[PDB]
Amino acid sequence: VVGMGIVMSLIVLAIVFGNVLVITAIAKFERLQTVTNYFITSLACADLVMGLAVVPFGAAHILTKTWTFGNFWCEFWTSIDVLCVTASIETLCVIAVDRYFAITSPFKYQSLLTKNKARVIILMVWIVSGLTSFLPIQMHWYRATHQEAINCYAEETCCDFFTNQAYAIASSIVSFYVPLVIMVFVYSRVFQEAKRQLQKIDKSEGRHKALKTLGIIMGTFTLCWLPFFIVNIVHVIQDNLIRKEVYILLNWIGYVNSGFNPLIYCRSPDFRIAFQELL
């Protein structure tokens, strides 16, 4: 009777609105065009596809309980989902490394990062993301062998995710773990440098904020994406261990992280000034 799809609809609305506003603010105002702002543009683009194309279809599968469209559309949708997730995570890793190189070596920062090199870095990230998602799925390498997967593949009405051990492990390793280690090392080094500067100032002037910022940045990403990949690894090893509904719920918890990115990275006085004029 009552339609409890409002919670799913608001997620799409917020994800579209925030990313569209960020993209328009960067594009229209020339005062915000900076090398560090191209990575934010790429991340916003990845988040925007997902609200428009993955969440709306996914909800219909959950609400209608059937996949009206064809099997080819299942393969295409799964490929887009994997592509966008891995691209967003790798963009976050690139942003962290850029901040590390900015803070650790200030004299050589300008030569290390130029407007030309950022283009190549972004293109390499997107190519690596595309190789992981489209090529294996579209060539039918990831498919399993057990009977339930075969029956699901044969029917053109159902649409469920079944994968084998090698693809699951390699996909998790490429998408999540190496970027996690890189960001951990980056932010530990940045925190050490900040603490040294604070103690120097205190020892100079004889007459918290960094911890809060790092906590926000690391904690939102870890809480959003860490729980899903653990069960992604586990469910292959032990088939009866984890039920499906938990898998879908954790995967949808992971999707919400796309709508939060403007809250963490975008805000700043210049971005606030830009946002004031548009609305």
Ligand X SMILES: CN[C@@H]1CCc2c(ccc(O)c2O)[C@H]1O
Residues found near ligand X in the complex (CB under 6 A): 78, 81-82, 85-86, 161, 171-172, 175, 251
Does the annotation list 163 as a binding residue? no
Question: By C-beta, is 24 or 68 nearer to ligand X?
Answer: 68
Question: By C-beta, is 39 or 225 nearer to ligand X?
Answer: 225
Q: Closest Cα partner for 173 from 217, 229, 237, 235?
A: 229
Shortest Å distance, C-beta 222 to ligand X: 16
Does the annotation list 202 as a binding residue? no
Say how far apart CA 180 and CA 189 lie, in whole Å: 14
Say how far apart CA 122 and CA 87 lie, in whole Å: 10
Does the annotation list 19 as a binding residue? no
Does the annotation list 133 as a binding residue? no
Shortest Å distance, C-beta 256 to ligand X: 13
Shortest Å distance, C-beta 211 to ligand X: 30
Question: By C-beta, is 25 or 84 nearer to ligand X?
Answer: 84
Using DSSP, state whether 37 is helix, strand or coil: helix
Taking the CA of residue 52 as centre, how many other CA atoms within 13 Å lie in the half-sphere pointing to its CB? 13
- Token readout for 89 is 């995570």
Using DSSP, state whether 139 is helix, strand or coil: coil
Shortest Å distance, C-beta 160 to ligand X: 9
Question: By C-beta, is 86 or 261 nearer to ligand X?
Answer: 86
Does the annotation list 68 as a binding residue? no
What residues contact residue 279 under an 8 Å CB cut-off, 6+ apart? none
Using DSSP, state whether 227 is helix, strand or coil: helix
Annotated binding site, which residues?
A: 81, 86, 171, 232, 251, 255
